[PDB]
Every structure is written in C-alpha cells, then in structure tokens.
Ligand binder design. Structure first.
Ligand SMILES: *C1=CC(=O)c2cccc(O)c2C1=O
Ligand SMILES: [Cl-]
Ligand SMILES: [Cl-]
Ligand SMILES: [Mn+2]
Ligand SMILES: [Zn+2]
Length: 472
C-alpha cells in the first residue's frame, strides 16, 4: 500500500533524523497523488522540528517547510491527536518565533480545533522573553476565550512581563490568578514576587483612602482570603521572608491567616468524577462492590491507607506502625470509632495475633481488603471523600494517576482532610493534622499580602512565606 509505504519510510526518517529525506518523501507523495493521514503529518512535524534555527543565513527548509506542512495539515481537515499538538509545539519551540507560534494557534481556532496549553507556550514564552507585554496579553486573552487554563509557568511569565513593563494593574491581576489557580508558588516565582514588592513601582502604586465597606463586601463575596479591589496603602513595602506558627499567625506581622471553606457542591462534583475515573481503571464490579460495602458500613472519622502506614520509612511492612496508627486515630475520634483500614487482600499477617486483629477489625466493620489486581489508592480516596472524614496517608498524591484529579479542588480537599504520620526517637508516632488555616496566597482587608512557597514536604522542610506589609 502507498500510505503504508510512506509511513514506513517516514518512521525510518524519524529514526535517523533525516529531515531532507522526509521533505523529499512529502513532495514525492504529492507528486504520486498519495493522501497524507494524521499519522503521516505527525511524523513530519516531529522530523521538521529537529532542524536548527539559522543565525547566519535565511531559515533552513526544515523549519520553514514544517510550518507549510502544518498549514497544509489543517487545510486538509486532518483530525489532530495529542501527538499533533505536541509536535506542532516542538516545531514552534525550534523556530523561536512567537508570532508564527501564535499563527499556528489562530489557524487551529479558525478550523474549529481546540488548542492545548502546550500549543500556546511557544507564543507566550517567546513574547515574554522579548518583553512584548501587549502580545503576551493577546496570547493570554486568546487562551481565556479558548477556555485553556494556565499553569504556574504561564502565570509566572505573565507576571514577569508585567513587572518589566511597569504594569502594576497586571501584576495585581496575575497575583490573584496565582492565588486562585496555583495557591503556593515555586522558588523562582516566590523570588519574582519578592522583587516586585521591593521595587520602586510597587512603592509608588497604591491609595491612601478607600471604601472600608466595599472591601468588606468583596471579602465576603470572594470566599475569604482576598478582596480583589486593588493595591491598598502607600509607600515602601516591608517585605520579609518568614513562617506561620501552628495556628496560622505570621511570625513577622502577627496577622492570623484565614481558613477558607470548601463549597460542599464542589465536593459532590469531585466525588462523581472520582467514581467515574475509578470505574474506567478498576474492574467495574470490584469498585461497585466496595461502594456497596461502604454504603453498609461506617460511620467513620478516619480512613487509613494501610499499605502506606505499613511501609512509610520501613524496609518492609511494619504491622506495629499500622496498628499504632489505628490506635491513635481511634484515640482522637470523639466516640472512639475505629478508622476504616484499607489493605490489599494479600495482607489480611504472619504472626497469629496480628492476623486475629486484622480479622477483628474486619468483623468490627473497620477493614476492607481490596481485591486481586486493584489499585487500592482509589478505594481509600473514595472512602474519605464519601465519608467526609480524615484521610491518613503519607502518599504524596501528586504523581501518576493523582494528576487526573486536577489542581483546583483536590489540593484544597487534601489540605483539609489529609493526616500524615511522623516518628521521632524521643516520642514515637505523631499524627500531623490538617492546619487551622489555608496555605494559600492571601490578601488581607488592609492590603497586607502573605505568599507561601510550594514545598515537597512541609513536615520535612519548614515552609517559607513572604510577608509584604505597608510601612505606613
Ligand atoms: C480551617 C480552620 C479551622 O479552624 C480548622 C480546624 C480544624 C480542622 C480543619 O481542617 C480546619 C480548617 O481547615
Ligand atoms: Cl459524629
Ligand atoms: Cl493480646
Ligand atoms: Mn498506595
Ligand atoms: Zn505577616
């Protein structure tokens, strides 16, 4: 077959980085009357993106033709897949022309194709590198219209370009978008934000007089932790790196951070999504069986990730650590409920009295053994969300299948529900409870800002905060 033969030769081309040969095969196919599929185009976009950007001559046919191939792909109305968008962006990155990168996205739009976040990157980051705020903001508005949500790198570059063009209104807006969408910021974004607050433009932006009750209403209206009404105060900002104590009080300024509620409707939506995701990956009957078991049991104040409690910081499964955690969860339950222990069925172990206790917990309605081949992470997560209770796990809950859960609701839910164990020589096991405040960028009623850094493990490393408060 002609298509089959092209594919083979393009795959060979892609294996060898043979861009000149891929371009000749592209032309030969046009001369032979062979129609290019989605697959064919995707290999060419990738192959073309291996071509260098020329400093010392006019652009090379590799990059130059890649863009013509992209435009021809879209005119054909070949249905894109995830490799299309990826390769399209690789080509855009290779070229380093934000305007042409932006052109590709405008083309997609014109032919009813939904662009991906990574399609916009080359445009945004390019325009941001060149200091062209106006075009960066055009790219941003375009993402917004296309309902593609930015992540931190995009928000950070917008922040940086706003700082570069002295655009204090845009700095403020991006800061709110970081609050809303990212919550805690990377080291590089943290440093950027500290620079902003120490800068002359920041010193010279503000108001001495404002409507105290209009701030009041916006605070109530936003959900708490911010007002969104603009920069307040005047003069130099006092900007310190600092920490919050255990009650959410800033050690620099003594402001008590707020605790922000989760709307129970978001929680219901999330619970549905969670069921939907689990059924796609689990054997439906296995997850349904747990749902039906759960409906018949409880109530629960805590759900334990048994495997994690057995294995965190251990060279092998520690029944002691599991059992000690169960006892401690029961001790903090106001009515002394046993926690729901989720374990794989291969455990339920080697010592007779431990086996008897596992069986006793099962007989008490407080243990569920997840079936052969299941991923027990779905089970403990669905249980804690459904029961609206504490979740006891040291699992980081970021990598692999937890990415499916998203980055708005789930992190907020985690913060309010997750209990982590820590162990010291002197004291043994401790339960580290949800904090009595929200770890998020916060803007107070008087215009004071507290900005938290993101960390791998906030029990391992004490979390750094920025405290930005007007000196008058
Ligand atoms: C926010 C505020 C608060 O006082 C509190 C107390 C106990 C447990 C929590 O999760 C919270 C909270 O999230
Ligand atoms: Cl109760
Ligand atoms: Cl005993
Ligand atoms: Mn696990
Ligand atoms: Zn403070």
């Amino acid at each position: 077959s002609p298509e089959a033969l092209l594919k083979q030769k393009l795959d060979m081309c892609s294996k060898k980085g043979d861009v000149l040969e891929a371009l000749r095969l592209y032309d030969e196919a046009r001369r032979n009357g062979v129609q290019l599929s989605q697959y064919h185009y995707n290999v060419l976009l990738y192959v073309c993106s291996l071509a260098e950007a020329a400093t010392e001559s006019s652009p090379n046919p590799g990059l130059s033709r890649g863009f013509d191939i992209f435009k021809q792909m879209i005119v054909d109305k070949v249905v894109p897949n995830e490799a299309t968008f990826t390769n399209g962006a690789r080509l855009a990155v290779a070229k380093d022309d934000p305007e042409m990168a932006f052109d590709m996205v405008k083309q997609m739009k014109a032919f009813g194709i939904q662009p991906r976040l990574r399609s916009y990157g080359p445009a945004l980051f390019g325009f941001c590198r060149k200091g062209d705020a106006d075009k960066a903001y055009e790219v941003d508005a375009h993402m917004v219209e296309s309902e593609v949500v930015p992540e931190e790198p995009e928000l950070a570059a917008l922040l940086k370009v706003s700082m570069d063009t002295k655009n204090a209104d845009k700095v403020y807006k991006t800061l709110q978008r970081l609050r809303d969408l990212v919550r805690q910021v990377s080291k590089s974004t943290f440093d950027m934000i500290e620079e902003w607050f120490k800068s002359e433009v920041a010193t010279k932006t503000g108001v001495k007089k404002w409507d105290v009750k209009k701030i009041r209403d916006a605070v109530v209206s936003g959900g708490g932790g911010w007002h969104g009404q603009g920069w307040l105060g005047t003069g130099k900002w006092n900007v310190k790196r600092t920490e919050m104590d255990e009650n959410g009080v800033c050690k620099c300024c003594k402001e008590k951070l707020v605790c922000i509620d989760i709307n129970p409707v978001e929680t219901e939506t999330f619970a549905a999504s969670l069921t939907r995701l689990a059924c796609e990956r689990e054997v439906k009957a296995n997850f349904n069986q747990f749902q039906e078991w759960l409906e018949r049991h409880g109530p629960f104040d805590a759900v334990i990730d048994g495997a994690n409690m057995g294995l965190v910081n251990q060279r092998s499964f520690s029944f002691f650590q599991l059992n000690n955690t169960v006892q401690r969860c029961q001790q903090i339950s106001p009515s002394k409920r046993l926690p729901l222990v989720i374990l794989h069925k291969s455990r339920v172990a080697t010592y007779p009295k431990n086996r008897a206790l596992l069986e006793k917990w099962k007989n008490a309605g407080a243990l569920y053994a997840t079936p052969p081949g299941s991923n027990d992470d779905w089970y403990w997560l669905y249980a804690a969300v459904s029961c609206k209770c504490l979740l006891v796990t040291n699992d980081e809950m970021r990598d692999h299948l937890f990415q499916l859960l998203g980055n708005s609701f789930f992190p907020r839910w985690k913060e309010k529900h997750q209990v982590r164990i820590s162990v010291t020589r002197e004291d043994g096991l401790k339960l580290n409870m949800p904090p009595p405040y929200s770890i998020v960028i916060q803007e107070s009623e008087d215009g004071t800002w507290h900005v938290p850094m993101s960390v791998e493990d906030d029990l391992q490393t004490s979390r750094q905060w920025l405290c930005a408060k007007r000196s008058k």
